[PDB]
Amino acid sequence: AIQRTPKIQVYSRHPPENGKPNFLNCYVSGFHPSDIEVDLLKNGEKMGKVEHSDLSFSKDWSFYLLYYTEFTPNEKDEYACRVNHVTLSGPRTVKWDRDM
Amino acid sequence: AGSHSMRYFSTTVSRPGRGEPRFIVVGYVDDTQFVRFDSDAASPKMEPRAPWMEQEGPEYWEEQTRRVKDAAQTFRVSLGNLRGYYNQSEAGSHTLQTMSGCDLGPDGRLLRGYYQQAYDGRDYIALNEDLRSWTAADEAAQNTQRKWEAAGVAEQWRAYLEGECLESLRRYLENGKETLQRAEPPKTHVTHHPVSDHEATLRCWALGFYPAEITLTWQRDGEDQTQDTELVETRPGGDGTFQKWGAVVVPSGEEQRYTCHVQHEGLPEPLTLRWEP
Numbered sequence: 001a002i003q004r005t006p007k008i009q010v011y012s013r014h015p016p017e018n019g020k021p022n023f024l025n026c027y028v029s030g031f032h033p034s035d036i037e038v039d040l041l042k043n044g045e046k047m048g049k050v051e052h053s054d055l056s057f058s059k060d061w062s063f064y065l066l067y068y069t070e071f072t073p074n075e076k077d078e079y080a081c082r083v084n085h086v087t088l089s090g091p092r093t094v095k096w097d098r099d100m
Numbered sequence: 101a102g103s104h105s106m107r108y109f110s111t112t113v114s115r116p117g118r119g120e121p122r123f124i125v126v127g128y129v130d131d132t133q134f135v136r137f138d139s140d141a142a143s144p145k146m147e148p149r150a151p152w153m154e155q156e157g158p159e160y161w162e163e164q165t166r167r168v169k170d171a172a173q174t175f176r177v178s179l180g181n182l183r184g185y186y187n188q189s190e191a192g193s194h195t196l197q198t199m200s201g202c203d204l205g206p207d208g209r210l211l212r213g214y215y216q217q218a219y220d221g222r223d224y225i226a227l228n229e230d231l232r233s234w235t236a237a238d239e240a241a242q243n244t245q246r247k248w249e250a251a252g253v254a255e256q257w258r259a260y261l262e263g264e265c266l267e268s269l270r271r272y273l274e275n276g277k278e279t280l281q282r283a284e285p286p287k288t289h290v291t292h293h294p295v296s297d298h299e300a301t302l303r304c305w306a307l308g309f310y311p312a313e314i315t316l317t318w319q320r321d322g323e324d325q326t327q328d329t330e331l332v333e334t335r336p337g338g339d340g341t342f343q344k345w346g347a348v349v350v351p352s353g354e355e356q357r358y359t360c361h362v363q364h365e366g367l368p369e370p371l372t373l374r375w376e377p
């Protein structure tokens with residue numbers, strides 16, 4: 001079996017503005033096999049009501065998924081995505097950068 | 101657009117001791133998902149995943165459900181067969197992926213038909229472009245090739261890919277035209293973030309575009325800095341659109357020697373952008 005490590009991007013749907021409702025996205029891609037754990041985190045805590053896209057894959061057979069939830073960003077709050085996969089030594093946490 | 105595609109992507113994953121393999125299939129027209137099936141759902145059936153699909157009547161959904169359940173049974177059998185071909189234990193989970201579908205060219209004919217499989221993330225077997233022959237990726241897959249050659253499988257796929265596959269694609273393009281036939285150009289802008297007193301990150305953004313295909317390249321003195329550019333994978337907005345950015349770190353005094361070039365279907369002319377303080 002050829003295994004592949006997930007790529008991870010954490011970002012918002014629309015340009016973030018404090019006080020305005022928005023969507024927080026965690027796009028994981030390029031991984032194999034398909035079993036994967038993905039959490040969206042608010043100040044280190046797992047957010048509820050996180051949905052995800054239907055499992056699909058790319059030309060090279062690697063899988064991708066979008067995990068997403070409503071959020072309203074501000075100055076106070078820190079957001080992140082934590083991903084676990086058999087290819088990782090432990091979960092990988094990527095912080096939300098409002099400029100990426 | 102002049103050309104369009106339809107694809108079905110199925111994933112079958114065994115789980116020894118925990119019941120039958122899980123089966124998921126998703127359908128896309130171009131970069132737009134339009135259906136799904138998940139064997140682990142409460143009452144598994146093919147379901148719409150685009151609003152324009154909701155107008156298909158109940159007999160459409162019943163037939164698609166019948167077809168995916170039939171495919172699922174064959175893929176569970178295949179998993180068994182392949183476990184044997186590779187001399188593998190019954191203890192481990194394995195994955196069978198399939199892709200099938202058709203590209204419609206501007207002459208209204210089949211540009212390319214596909215039917216191919218992967219086992220544990222590696223190429224296994226693929227229908228060739230002539231839709232009359234197979235490529236096996238290894239010796240084990242030659243077992244499958246021999247059986248499919250004897251059973252006339254390629255001709256069955258040829259008939260589907262040149263007929264119903266395209267007929268369905270044409271119908272979806274009509275029913276979904278307001279969104280499927282609309283090329284949404286990227287909203288673009290350049291941001292600037294000092295990383296020191298002497299250098300800054302120039303980031304070129306493309307947002308809200310459809311379809312996903314796009315080119316985003318930073319230029320300096322009219323050629324591309326592909327090696328000094330951080331270019332992220334094109335990513336979904338979650339609203340049916342896509343996003344991408346590319347960034348370079350440059351000396352403060354050379355900032356205006358940099359331009360970002362953006363090409364996309366929905367743009368009349370390619371954009372050349374710059375940091376506009």
Ligand SMILES: CCCCCCCCCCCCCCCC(=O)OC[C@H](O)CO
Nearest residue numbers: 108109110125167171198199200256260
């Ligand atoms: C195929 C990649 C994923 C596989 C998951 C299975 C469902 C895909 C088919 C969806 C039903 C509508 C099209 C039916 C295709 C079909 O009729 O089969 C072809 C030839 O007829 C073979 O004989």
Ligand SMILES: [Zn+2]
Nearest residue numbers: 101102103281
């Ligand atoms: Zn078109």
Ligand SMILES: [Zn+2]
Nearest residue numbers: 238239240242
């Ligand atoms: Zn041999």
Ligand SMILES: [Zn+2]
Nearest residue numbers: 291292293301
């Ligand atoms: Zn910047």
Ligand SMILES: [Zn+2]
Nearest residue numbers: 296297298299
């Ligand atoms: Zn200095």
